[PDB]
Design a protein around this ligand. Structure first.
Ligand SMILES: Cc1cn([C@H]2C[C@H](O)[C@@H](COP(=O)(O)OP(=O)(O)OP(=O)(O)O)O2)c(=O)[nH]c1=O
Ligand SMILES: [Mn+2]
Ligand SMILES: [Mn+2]
Length: 333
């Protein structure tokens, strides 16, 4: 017996069912490309169940008694076990719609809605996009300019080098300010599509105006290819960057997300930003459905009492929701 919510079970970085989960996640992704959010969540949940299993699924009798394994997901696994291939998955992979949506959505600054609009307007290739620059935001233009580098997986060695330059810029700008690696790398992943950093200072308010000073310093060093600063609107101050990472004899563009949070909200921001996306979806669903509380990256709110939970750590937040603590490396749902 394995719990239904991904936030109630450990999901390690590496598991025994990568072929099966990858097939399900292709179907999940394709459903998201078509706007079928329910079907996406269904396939994603089924894939995450396989990730938590302690052993490989070699016979279909091993699916018996597992949550989130309805008919469609079971059939996928069945065809894979019996034939080594699932024809729906292979049709999806080869389809022009999926390949194009995948191409466009992996461009920096392009979501599903934009990608689908461009598809419907007869755009197919990266060159087609380049021929219509009036259709692109500045962020999207930067993404296209650097798309080869931005499609190259980011390595832990890249992350280490980047964290050093970000730490130096932060340390110079404001003594005492801290940089915390979040995102998939904090969950132990060995590769990723970007690097995520969360910046704070232990005195509430000392972080005001820090990010722009950090960016000035990084810019002066030649380390920034693209930078979009956004002030908090509703809602953290952040900078969407492409860094020019020096390498032995060349350089690579790398996506970096810098997020500033006031230290009061830091444990919520850390939790939210550490992911995985599905784990956080599941944790927020759990908080709302099971405990009546709204969790987001800024706080945990009781909307009946009209109160906010004070947390000093991620552990406090788990405790408050009635969940066993999961370290970041077990949140790979
Ligand atoms: C869009 C959004 C994401 N997040 C979270 C969810 C993600 O788990 C987390 C990091 O985003 P990413 O950098 O997209 O995801 P990742 O680091 O888990 O994986 P990858 O290797 O592909 O980079 O940010 C928020 O907290 N608030 C938001 O508004
Ligand atoms: Mn990331
Ligand atoms: Mn990111």
């Amino acid at each position: 017996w394995m719990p239904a919510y991904a936030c109630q079970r450990p999901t390690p970085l590496t598991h025994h069912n990568t072929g099966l989960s990858e097939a399900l996640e292709i179907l999940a992704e394709a459903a998201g490309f078509e706007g079928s959010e329910g079907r996406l969540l269904t396939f994603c949940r089924a894939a995450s169940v396989l990730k938590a299993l302690p052993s490989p699924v070699t016979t279909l009798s091993q699916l018996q008694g597992l949550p989130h394994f309805g008919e469609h997901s079971s059939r996928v696994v069945q065809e894979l076990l019996e034939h080594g291939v699932c024809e729906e998955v292979e049709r999806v992979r080869r389809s022009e719609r999926y390949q194009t949506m995948k191409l466009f959505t992996q461009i920096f600054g392009v979501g599903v809605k934009t990608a689908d609009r461009w598809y419907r307007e007869g755009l197919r290739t990266l060159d087609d996009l380049r021929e219509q620059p009036q259709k692109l935001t500045q962020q999207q233009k930067a993404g296209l300019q650097h798309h080869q580098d931005l499609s190259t997986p980011v390595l832990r060695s890249d992350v280490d080098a980047l964290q050093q330059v970000v730490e130096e810029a932060v340390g110079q700008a404001l003594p005492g300010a801290t940089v915390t690696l979040t995102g998939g790398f904090r969950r132990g992943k060995l590769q990723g599509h970007d690097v995520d950093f969360l910046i704070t200072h232990p005195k509430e308010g000392q972080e005001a105006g820090l990010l722009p000073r950090v960016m000035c310093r990084l810019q002066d060093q030649g380390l920034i290819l693209y930078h979009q600063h956004q002030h908090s609107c509703c809602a953290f101050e952040r900078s969407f960057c492409i860094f020019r990472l020096p390498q032995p004899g060349s350089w690579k563009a790398v996506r970096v997300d810098l997020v500033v949070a006031p230290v009061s909200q830091f444990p919520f921001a850390l939790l939210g930003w550490t992911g995985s996306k599905l784990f956080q979806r599941e944790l927020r669903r759990f908080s709302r459905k099971e405990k009546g509380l709204w969790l987001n990256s800024h706080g945990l709110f009781d909307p009946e009492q009209k109160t906010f939970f004070q947390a000093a750590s991620e552990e406090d937040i788990f405790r408050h929701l009635g969940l066993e603590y999961l370290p970041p490396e077990q949140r790979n749902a």
